[PDB]
Design a protein around this nucleic acid. Structure first.
Ligand SMILES: Nc1ncnc2c1ncn2[C@@H]1O[C@H](COP(=O)(O)OP(=O)(O)OP(=O)(O)O)[C@@H](O)[C@H]1O
Ligand SMILES: Nc1ncnc2c1ncn2[C@@H]1O[C@H](COP(=O)(O)OP(=O)(O)O)[C@@H](O)[C@H]1O
Ligand SMILES: [Mg+2]
Ligand SMILES: [Mg+2]
Ligand SMILES: [Zn+2]
Lengths: 588, 376
DNA sequence: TTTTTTTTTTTTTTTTTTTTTTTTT
DNA sequence: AAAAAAAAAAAAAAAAAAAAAAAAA
């Protein structure tokens, strides 16, 4: 009898071991945390009692109800003692997952209706969380009696009110009916699985209490659900639109041990060196550029003064060079390694603008914010290749954003200031294509204002060398043949995230003094050089460059988790800024 | 197309020792001449070997090809043949006259009335070939999308609410006409084509198709096309090319099974060649050679090895890849630099080029000079 | 009284025109 | 500085999916 099946589910939940009882303790912790849901591994259920799993696969509709009831009873048995005001037991949604490979959407024929089905896809739209009634109460209009606790079926299955206590005298009381979360999603077939000449198929997913908003459109998802049709008061004849009842969702693509690992990694005397050589090992040369990119990755510290003004702590880097150097490769690595990162071109990307835009839906009249690379990359890195080929609107937008960290947009509907706290890493080629010294300082068309934004500007050249060419060709061939001190991508990314979230340093008095004196000397030298050349170098030095040097020192000290930036790191930051002053001054 | 015992067939002629010439001659049999273009398209079809050392250096295994040429030279014919012969191959045009566009978007499909994510054409050819005709007549957004696909091998969509990144690992075979409708060798390639340098920098082979007046070739092509017209009338409806079905079976087997490894490449020869090319190109005011050229040579050597299913790139494969890469790079240069690099590297460019071909070319040049002197 | 066909309304999308904006001589 | 081409706004039309009311028997 169904009671026997529920009893067996209770035994499986209470006594499945692995020693430790996984599901009993999971119920304890979730109910104590208030989650009131669990994730049941299908294979464990099958192993403990294979008949239960087979029943689930053949008749999910009521067997999952039995499992949920059993889980509710077990949770009561494990967490019954509660303080007054919450002792009432809470139903438990039971999500189920399995390692079984998903079945292509094309195999969802009629026969699989009402069976548990696992399919892959890409969610292209998700509806807002809403209210569906699990328990409703109906009151007669004439006799004003009540029929409380009318069980409501899950899924897209409405309900018909009773006709006889007049006739059809009942109305629903909103204030007495219990409802839960609710959401509808559109799942498209993964483009890889779509046959060559063929449209992509679709399906409609229906979420539930805790499955709502577990995914957002664009996620690559694996869905385990109940293939079901709508049940709404009953040339195509007898066709009922079909949908999936979502039960398990898996979205495809820090432990204390790792925290201590990061702590010891930072404590290394040469942590800077190992990080420097651990970003683009495949790319040969450019040690200074790699050090600068590490500094950019770690970033400085954002400061908000008591007056409320904000000093950005994110470094902005620019790289002008011949089209031969591996700089787009460098940007690709940076976007692949930064915790939050996005690669894009000067003119945005493919159907993904650079800066955010705001438009009002003429029908729904909402304020839709189409996010560009900048807003999407908030708190991370935006790698802009071909940074010299922006569009005027985008040029102004980035002009504002790189300094203030905010994009201010005011449309016919509203004014607003989206927060884009992104570190910009820009790549570019000379105006002519190849850097020619004869027209030095004329190889850059950037207006002086923009060049002020970038903390550092690197200049790359390939004008002449034979030994370097031989070494480069042999190194590339060696890399293609093969295909220690290197922090792997995942470990490095997690270390970067931990350092950024945890440690924010500040300068020390002596460091500030040294940087002050050095900056004064740099300003004097730049002014004298500009006077001697009788022209303004299109690569100025401003107090913004002082902020850049301070930020680089802060990043160097943040690598080590040291709260204060010492004199040595300020000297190293000064050297890094000197490797760009080599373009500020030696260029002319 | 999942057959068995045809592995024997493919291997049976794989050991022919001249299969390279057969396959190079078995591409678009309805197009006369343009043997170098056919070789390049064969190498593109068989493809290279994608490799991502660690997980931070993504190197594409594709061989993108760009055929830039004055009109009336059967470039679109080559693109259509590739469409016909290669599985997962899609065709699109720079104009909007193509069924599917280059850029992704989301909308309700006009016939199905259902809201779907129309992925860009490049995505549809995720592991195949994307043929782009009128490559020099695209939109700004089309140019951005092709740039993104060629650079990062993926597309990022944030149109309605779909913040996603779906990968498009396509081989782009493009066709285009020079600025002004005629290719002028006195100007470098990058300046007589309506394409920015970054776009052209991502193509592994540049085929400069030129329509130069030549009585013998003109007569031969006239005979070819007129015979085609005769043979396809409604009433009547130096090796041997492989049949097209067997050619595509061979392509499938090679592209799916054999993965050549370059453990036998002569690093000495390649390094010396690269250094010499750098010195020569910089000695003149010419577009220089860069690392990506060595990358393309590696990919083409791997593809040529794949044609022969060697599983190990051999010296001759490397030499042939160098031949093709140097031919493209030289033809991209201006007129004077063309001869400069031809004479300076004639040894490399003459690999597997028998004496008869060079002698015929020189005799044709001399007789053309005589003709020009006569008729001026 | 009970069904049924209509009525609406409420969203959403699509197409034409106009207007506004961008690029070129 | 002014004209030509392109892009976007905006307004009107169509599909349509579903809930409620009036007329019919
Ligand atoms: N080498 C050739 N062999 C056979 N037929 C050829 C050859 N060159 C041109 N033709 C024929 O001449 C005609 C012109 O070729 P096609 O229409 O493909 O031009 P195209 O190179 O694509 O030009 P465009 O750049 O203007 O589109 C076609 O009918 C084609 O069959
Ligand atoms: N120093 C280097 N080390 C390793 N590979 C390099 C180096 N320089 C260039 N390359 C190779 O040359 C190719 C060109 O690099 P890329 O970043 O595309 O240039 P750009 O940024 O100008 O487009 C890349 O595929 C890269 O692998
Ligand atoms: Mg680049
Ligand atoms: Mg054509
Ligand atoms: Zn009643």
């Amino acid at each position: 009898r169904k009671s026997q099946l529920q009893r067996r589910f209770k035994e499986f939940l209470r006594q499945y071991r692995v020693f430790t009882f996984k599901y009993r303790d999971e119920l304890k912790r979730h109910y104590n945390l208030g989650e009131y849901w669990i994730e049941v591994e299908m294979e464990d259920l099958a192993s403990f009692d294979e008949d239960l799993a087979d029943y689930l696969y053949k008749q999910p509709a009521e067997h999952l109800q039995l499992l949920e009831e059993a889980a509710k009873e077990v949770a009561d048995e494990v967490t019954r003692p509660r303080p007054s005001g919450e002792e009432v037991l809470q139903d438990i949604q039971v999500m189920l997952k399995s390692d079984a490979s998903p079945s292509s959407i094309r195999s969802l024929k009629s026969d699989m209706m009402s069976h548990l089905v696992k399919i892959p896809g890409i969610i292209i739209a998700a509806s807002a969380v809403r209210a569906k009634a699990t328990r409703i109460s109906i009151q007669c209009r004439s006799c004003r009696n009540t029929l409380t606790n009318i069980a409501m079926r899950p899924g897209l299955e409405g309900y018909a009110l009773p006709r006889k206590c007049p006739l059809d005298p009942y109305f629903i009381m909103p204030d007495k009916c219990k409802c839960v979360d609710f959401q509808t999603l559109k799942l498209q077939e993964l483009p890889d699985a779509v046959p060559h000449g063929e449209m992509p198929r679709h399906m409609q997913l229906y979420c539930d209490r805790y499955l709502c908003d577990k995914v957002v459109p664009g996620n690559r998802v694996t869905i385990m659900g109940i293939y079901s049709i709508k049940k709404f008061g009953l040339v195509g004849v007898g066709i009922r639109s079909s949908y999936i009842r979502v039960l398990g969702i898996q979205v495809d693509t820090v432990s204390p041990q790792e925290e201590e690992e990061f702590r010891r990694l930072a404590a290394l005397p040469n942590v800077y060196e190992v990080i420097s050589k651990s970003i683009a090992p495949s790319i040969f040369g450019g040690t200074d550029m790699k050090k600068a990119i590490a500094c950019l990755l770690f970033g400085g510290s954002r400061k908000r003064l008591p007056d409320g003004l904000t000093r950005r702590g994110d470094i902005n880097l620019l790289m002008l060079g011949d089209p031969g150097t591996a700089k787009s490769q460098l940007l690709k690595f940076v976007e692949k390694c930064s915790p939050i990162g996005v690669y894009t071109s000067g003119k945005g990307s493919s159907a993904a603008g650079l800066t955010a835009s705001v438009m009002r839906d003429p029908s729904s009249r909402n304020f839709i914010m189409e996010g560009g690379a900048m807003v999407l990359a908030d708190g991370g890195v935006v790698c802009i290749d071909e940074f010299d080929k922006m569009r005027e609107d985008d040029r102004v937008a980035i002009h504002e954003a790189m300094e203030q960290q905010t994009i201010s947009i005011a449309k016919a509907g509203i004014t607003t200031t989206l927060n884009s706290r992104c570190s910009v890493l820009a790549a570019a080629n000379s105006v002519f294509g190849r850097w020619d010294e004869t027209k030095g300082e004329d190889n850059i068309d950037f207006m002086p204002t923009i060049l002020s934004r970038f903390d550092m500007i690197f200049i790359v050249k390939d004008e002449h060398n034979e030994e370097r060419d031989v070494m480069l060709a042999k190194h590339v061939i060696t890399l293609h043949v093969s295909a220690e001190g290197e922090i792997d991508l995942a470990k490095l990314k997690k270390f970067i995230a931990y350092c950024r979230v945890k440690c924010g340093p500040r300068l020390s008095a002596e460091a500030a003094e040294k940087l002050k004196n050095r900056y004064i000397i740099m300003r004097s030298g730049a002014r004298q050089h500009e006077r001697d050349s009788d022209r303004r170098s299109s690569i100025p030095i401003t107090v913004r460059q002082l902020e850049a040097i301070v930020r680089i020192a802060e990043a160097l000290s943040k690598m080590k988790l040291q709260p204060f930036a010492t004199e040595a790191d300020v000297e190293e930051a000064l050297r890094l800024f000197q490797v760009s002053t080599l373009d500020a001054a030696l260029s002319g | 197309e999942l057959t068995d015992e045809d592995v024997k067939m493919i291997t049976s002629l794989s050991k022919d020792q001249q299969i390279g010439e057969k396959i190079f001659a078995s591409i678009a049999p309805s197009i006369y001449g343009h043997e170098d273009i056919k070789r390049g398209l064969a190498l593109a079809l068989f493809g290279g070997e994608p490799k991502n050392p660690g997980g931070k250096h993504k190197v594409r295994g594709d061989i993108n090809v760009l055929l830039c040429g004055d009109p009336g030279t059967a470039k679109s014919q080559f693109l259509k043949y590739i469409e016909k012969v290669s599985s997962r191959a899609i065709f699109t045009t720079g104009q909007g006259a193509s069924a599917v566009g280059l850029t992704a978007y989301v909308q309700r499909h006009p016939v199905s009335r259902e809201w779907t994510l129309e992925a860009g054409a490049l995505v549809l050819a995720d592991r195949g070939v994307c043929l782009i005709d009128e490559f020099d007549k695209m939109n700004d957004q089309d140019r951005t999308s092709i740039h993104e696909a060629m650079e990062q091998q993926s597309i990022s969509i944030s149109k309605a609410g779909i913040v996603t990144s779906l990968q498009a690992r396509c081989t782009v075979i493009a066709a285009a006409n020079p600025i002004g409708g005629r290719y002028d060798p006195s100007l470098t390639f990058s300046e007589n084509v309506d394409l920015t340098e970054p776009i052209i920098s991502r193509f592994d082979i540049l085929c400069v198709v030129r329509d130069t007046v030549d009585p013998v070739q003109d007569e031969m092509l006239a005979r070819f096309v007129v015979g085609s017209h005769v043979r396809h009338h409604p009433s009547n409806k130096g090796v041997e090319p492989l049949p097209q079905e067997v050619l595509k079976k061979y392509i499938i087997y090679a592209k799916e099974r054999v993965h050549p490894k370059l453990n036998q490449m002569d690093q000495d020869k390649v390094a010396k060649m690269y250094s010499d090319l750098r010195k020569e190109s910089m000695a003149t005011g010419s577009i220089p050679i860069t690392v990506r050229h060595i990358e393309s040579m590696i990919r083409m050597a791997e593809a040529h090895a794949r044609i022969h299913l060697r599983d190990y790139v051999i010296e001759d494969d490397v030499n042939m890849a160098i031949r093709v890469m140097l031919e493209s790079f030289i033809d991209t240069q201006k007129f004077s630099v063309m001869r400069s690099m031809r004479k300076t590297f004639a040894r490399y460019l003459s690999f597997r080029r028998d004496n008869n071909e060079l002698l015929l070319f020189i005799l044709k040049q001399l007789v053309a000079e005589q003709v020009t002197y006569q008729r001026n």
